[PDB]
Symmetry: D3
Subunit: 295 residues, 6 copies
Amino acid sequence: SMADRDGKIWMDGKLIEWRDAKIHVLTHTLHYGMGVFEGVRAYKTADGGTAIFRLKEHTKRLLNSAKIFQMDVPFDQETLEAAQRDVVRENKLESCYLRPIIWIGSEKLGVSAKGNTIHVAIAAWPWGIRVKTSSFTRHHVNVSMVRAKASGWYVNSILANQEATADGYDEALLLDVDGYVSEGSGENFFLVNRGKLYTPDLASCLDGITRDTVITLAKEAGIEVIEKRITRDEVYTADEAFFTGTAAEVTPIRELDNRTIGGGARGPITEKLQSAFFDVVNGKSAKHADWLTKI
Amino acid sequence: MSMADRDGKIWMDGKLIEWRDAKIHVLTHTLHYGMGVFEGVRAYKTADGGTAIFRLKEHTKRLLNSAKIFQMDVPFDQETLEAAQRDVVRENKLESCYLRPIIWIGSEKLGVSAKGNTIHVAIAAWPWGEEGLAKGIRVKTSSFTRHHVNVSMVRAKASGWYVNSILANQEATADGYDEALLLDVDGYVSEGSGENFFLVNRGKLYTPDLASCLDGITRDTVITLAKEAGIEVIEKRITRDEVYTADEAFFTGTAAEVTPIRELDNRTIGGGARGPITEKLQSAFFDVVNGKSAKHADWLTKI
Amino acid sequence: SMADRDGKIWMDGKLIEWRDAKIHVLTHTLHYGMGVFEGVRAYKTADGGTAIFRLKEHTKRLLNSAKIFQMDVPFDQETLEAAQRDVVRENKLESCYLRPIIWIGSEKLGVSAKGNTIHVAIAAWPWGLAKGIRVKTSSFTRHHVNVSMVRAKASGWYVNSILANQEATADGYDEALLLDVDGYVSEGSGENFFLVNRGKLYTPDLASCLDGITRDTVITLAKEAGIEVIEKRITRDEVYTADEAFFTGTAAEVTPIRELDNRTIGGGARGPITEKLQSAFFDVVNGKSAKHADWLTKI
Amino acid sequence: SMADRDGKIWMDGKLIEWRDAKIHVLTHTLHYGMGVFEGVRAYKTADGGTAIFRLKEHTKRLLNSAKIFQMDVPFDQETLEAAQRDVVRENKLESCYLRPIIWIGSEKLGVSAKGNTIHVAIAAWPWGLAKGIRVKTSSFTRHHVNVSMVRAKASGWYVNSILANQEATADGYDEALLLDVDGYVSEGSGENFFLVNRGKLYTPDLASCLDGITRDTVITLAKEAGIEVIEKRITRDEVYTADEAFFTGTAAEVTPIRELDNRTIGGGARGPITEKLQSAFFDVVNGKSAKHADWLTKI
Amino acid sequence: SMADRDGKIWMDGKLIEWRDAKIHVLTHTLHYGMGVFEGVRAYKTAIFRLKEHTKRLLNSAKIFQMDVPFDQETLEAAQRDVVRENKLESCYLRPIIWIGSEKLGVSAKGNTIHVAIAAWPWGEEGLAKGIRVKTSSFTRHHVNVSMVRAKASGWYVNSILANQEATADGYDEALLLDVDGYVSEGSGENFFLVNRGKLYTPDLASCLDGITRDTVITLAKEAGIEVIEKRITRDEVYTADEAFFTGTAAEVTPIRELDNRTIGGGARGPITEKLQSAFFDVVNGKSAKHADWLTK
Amino acid sequence: SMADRDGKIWMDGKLIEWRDAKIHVLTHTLHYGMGVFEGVRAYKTADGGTAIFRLKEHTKRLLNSAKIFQMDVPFDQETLEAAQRDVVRENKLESCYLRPIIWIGSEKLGVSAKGNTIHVAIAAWPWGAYLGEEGLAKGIRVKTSSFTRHHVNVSMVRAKASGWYVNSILANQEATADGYDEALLLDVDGYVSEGSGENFFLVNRGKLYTPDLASCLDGITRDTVITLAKEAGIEVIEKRITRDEVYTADEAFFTGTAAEVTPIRELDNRTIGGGARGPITEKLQSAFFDVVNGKSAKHADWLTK
Ligand SMILES: [Cl-]
Ligand SMILES: [Cl-]
Ligand SMILES: [Cl-]
Ligand SMILES: [Cl-]
Ligand SMILES: [Cl-]
Ligand SMILES: [Cl-]
């Protein structure tokens, strides 16, 4: 169990024993879906030291998700950044994944309840493919607030992922309400064609930090980056395709809907970009030193 | 105080436990990812002094159907869950009350796509708008759009589904209205943030088709009573401006019962008060839930 | 010119000379399109009298159109039903067409002006069907129900109708048919649409189309004759393969459609259900129907 | 009252007295919505003179709007420019707002009227900014681009604006922001919409929104400051999390938005890029810019 | 091979030998998709609803403004003669109308409108136990892009794509949603669901106006079953009492699972069984009532 | 009749007599619409030679269309490039039109037949530019269709497939029935997509605008003109375009293999600009003719002789 572990969790202003990070079943977010979270990675750098990747941007995105929902968080940004470093340090972790989550408490359990506590907890733990286009449609931008990385949004991801894996695929790819490629269930989507890098415009899809990272490295590598509406059959005829996300970083996609992408192998743009990414997270990059925060 | 900090009994994973011991870890799958399902059920103090749950079979069927939509294997069958609900009312010494069964995904693995998590079940209950029911309420059309039927499984009564309802209800209430009315992605009226919507025009009863909206038990109840009153019930696509010109309008829901709407977007609905068909359906609904109907005695389970 | 006539117009409470029914170019409705109107007919009835068809319902729809716009009309329904009759009476008209219109006046220009006078004016003037018309499906799409309030009969909504109708008549067709934003048949540029197939009467559901009073009249008549009426989404190619089709409107009445997009509808002339409904309609407007006498108001 | 004033209106070829600018209530545009207008300003300049801002571009847009609707305007561009200056000059106006309007007359009052006169009239009259306004996202949806011709500045277009604007003001906000049919931000009820993020300027692509002359002025100024301008689909929650946001229009000039849907924008006052572009805009309209002197016409 | 067989095909007004029914590769329909066809069955008790199929055929040509140089009666007799001359009994008839080889522009007019009719002899436990269906990730036709009442060669690419998607992952058939996300139909069948004793089907909207559908609707009504045409969500299927497909090929086929969710008890439902039996009793001439649906 | 002619057609690996290139009526693609084709030109060039224009990209696109449909084409790309060339040479042609087509054969005729032969054929024939010459010089009259262009998750719009053309036939017939030269289709959202066989361009204030590659086809002639435009220093913008943007544009034109670069002088009875071929259109048309006629060192690899 992830519940049954030795360690420390930061909760509501202090470190507590991991197993004591409990709440009641009548917690608003459990019933109604309004809570926000992040996924942040720490890496063991070439130093031998450990640093968190883009800590500032992730924490700002967390507080912005809360802002979208008018959730007043009782901690400033600096407290939350320091808390995340503390969780890595006091758990004696090196390469790990951090999960900050902000949720609405147990005072009142109507839909419309106001006056519930806004809770915050932070835990951490140590830390090409075949893809199938999902029969489930990606979020509508005036139904769901797709810039807020919110607990309720993942039902659609779960459904899509479960569909893909039940039939033996590695991951799902979702189309938007107009039938264009939007994203994977937990990742942003990219395609390579004629030496140029394409990605769905920032419309229905999440505003990813790994996406932002890859986009910037591509421009610095002199690769043209185009944001546009992409049809499923552009993917089938692309030269390369890949996913980006905090968990997996850059994953090449060798097949969609049983149509081989390019030669079926990892492509040279995908490799150059994957390498440039490795250099930046292992702290072998002078240019992007400010993306790594040592614990 | 707080809903967590109470004396009584909650049924959880097969047994009654003390209320305060119904606890989950913060790394619980549903808390992070939104896939969980719940019901809201009412128990009423009936005309004969007793207590009875209203449409327990149908709510418990719907709960299990919601889990089925999500391929959540519930480790308890329907009969067990009906009996557990009656136990929670009994052992908390409740009369008129609200029941809240909830099924969620546990703490074993915390990826999006983790499989082999425990499917947990809990049932809590607690005791249970006089002006609104009599005079009607003021409703505002929301700027947020109701769920798309191939994005969200709108027949499944799911935790994640409610973000949209909170946002719409917060907008209405911030500007001083009683409730929100949401339109679907094509601009037709769908439903309230926790209620189904009806309108009356020239002695006929209209409701949005069972398209983007929840398949509501109170809705089903009111439609059956309407038909038993010889009232034509028509499922159709309804524009916001049909509402503005309707003879009457109202909401239905387990919490909401039958709540008349006297105003939408600052346009008065008919005479500005409870309408005569709304009152008739409201009144027949109250007879059925207070155990004063012989026809619908089978909708009440003594508890 | 419609402006240069003898006779009387009812304006803001009283009968005035026709030519004196004038407003300033800085009238809010002229600039910004928020005004509402109606079309109502009077007929010569079998007994030689003259009577307005469904006066109550037309006036209700007019005050409802205002209500939708939150336009506070300074006259009640009894007053506007009385005034309409007065306009027919004083202009010595028999068979004619009435045009009440309610608009926002001249005190303040600017989109968001509050405090303008809400004016009312009623004018009236003297006023295919056996054969069938040729129709063209428009390349312009009909109103979205959350952009325009389609239950309000509003000045601004008719830009769309003008574009469609001009597109049709420029290429030699009689009228346009408009599809909705989903590609399904909605209505003509100023009339509701019906189709007949295997003895049943179909018509687009009351979604984006106008709630026509002629539409309602003909639905009622159809039901009373034992014809099944079905309101559904209709594709253009159900029209091509239908047995009959027609339009309804106050000015139209029931007009048969013999061709859509150069595909012949049925045998290419007026069909038998259309004929029966037309005949039923004329019995009601000419005062031959005891059942429906309260649809006619004498004077 | 805007009808009851001293001054002169240019109408159908000549200056006439202001109160003589009258039309009949049976005027086609009043009933059916197809007429077009333009909003133009004259500003007092730094040399003490007075000039109209982008007269040539506003007049072209007006004539384009009529073209889109196939309204044959009986005056050429040069005549209409001279006419607008004559209206400013002859009413002894300095800082003012000018409103050329073109509409369809009174000869026939059917929907589909051929051979109505195309009328033209021009009037003019004398004519928050600092750390912003509070905006509410409308429940009404913005125009569909194949139902309404959104490039044509059309009387009927404004009914949607009036509805959104009244909804926002009724609840105590300053203005509405409208989403398009797909849920993306389109524009204000009378202004275009811009957001700033990470030192770049974003605006909804010219899709469902108006082709603004202030919008154009501001985009040009931005690019001349070396600010990157990107047209893209913008979600409402992108605005909640943006560094800055503002509106543009002829009447609004550049108005900062400090709050949308009770979410503070940035720090909740006017932002640095908005202030820069606002200052640049005022430098150009007050004639302090040699570079953009050809945007001003001496009166 | 279907091209290499003993028999007769009726083509452009006369019976020719089967292997003689040939066209050139520069045939307009082959390149541009505008052709129309039918599927008709004959049963051992009779062609089933020959008049109605032949009328739908001529209506499809009409929608496309394809002038067919034969009347309905001629085409009805020809179909009868094609079954006869191949000495067929239980069989499938395929009339096809297409556009010939005169001009290969998109916009070419003055191409010949050809007609050919073939037939050939004609899933028990699928009919008995029910099938496993997968909701497609391809969307069903838009009704102002494709003329969905016309049974048109080009309309079948969407069907093929979907069917292949479903079969590749081991399902029996695909189910397609429309552009709005509602249940439309299978790749060659109409869709029905039963709930609380009542029969539901997507409204005639994006779906094909099926002859088997119509048959089944009429039997249901005669049996006193309420039939409702409405928009249906995919999750309404998952929680339905019963579901099935109708089609000239599919007859009445139960659906026992959709997207790995069991429908009701996982077998053929009682209202499905009753409808399927009414259907087979009609096609095998065991019902006086509907005698005028069979030709002999 | 295109069936009744002297010449050679390449079919399933061989040159045979034109008239022998026959199939049965029971051919899957005739019934079900799954087949794919190209249109490709050859021109007589500056030195008396003749060359096929962008053969590489037309043949890669053909095979990609098969890919999208999962049609296993039994020849690789080289053989098909050479086969197209063979067919121009043997029929002794110069300025001509080539039509390769890949279709599903006659073994099984169920919808989901998954065992047919994948057949391939190439035909070519001559092209007379004078008959379309005045449209090229003076521009054409276009009518917005009441039919909507393909939805990108119903039809695979990057596959140039036999079945997509029903929509094009319908729109074209509607335009030509009422006396217009061509149709313009709007997409499911009301924006300008393309003509029934051509990509659409607009010019305004010196800049070149075209519909984003969304529901419209990824035209080789579209790509050719965008490239030439960028090389001439013209800003190119791919955006959503309303129909009233065309009514007020300074110039407009269609591109396509058949249509080359064809100006549009009127849409929906609204004159485009001065009502004649505009200057930018003329420049880009001349650059296009320069490239196809072998008058450009910059794009010499687009011609195979
Ligand atoms: Cl993550
Ligand atoms: Cl509830
Ligand atoms: Cl009328
Ligand atoms: Cl303005
Ligand atoms: Cl079949
Ligand atoms: Cl071509």
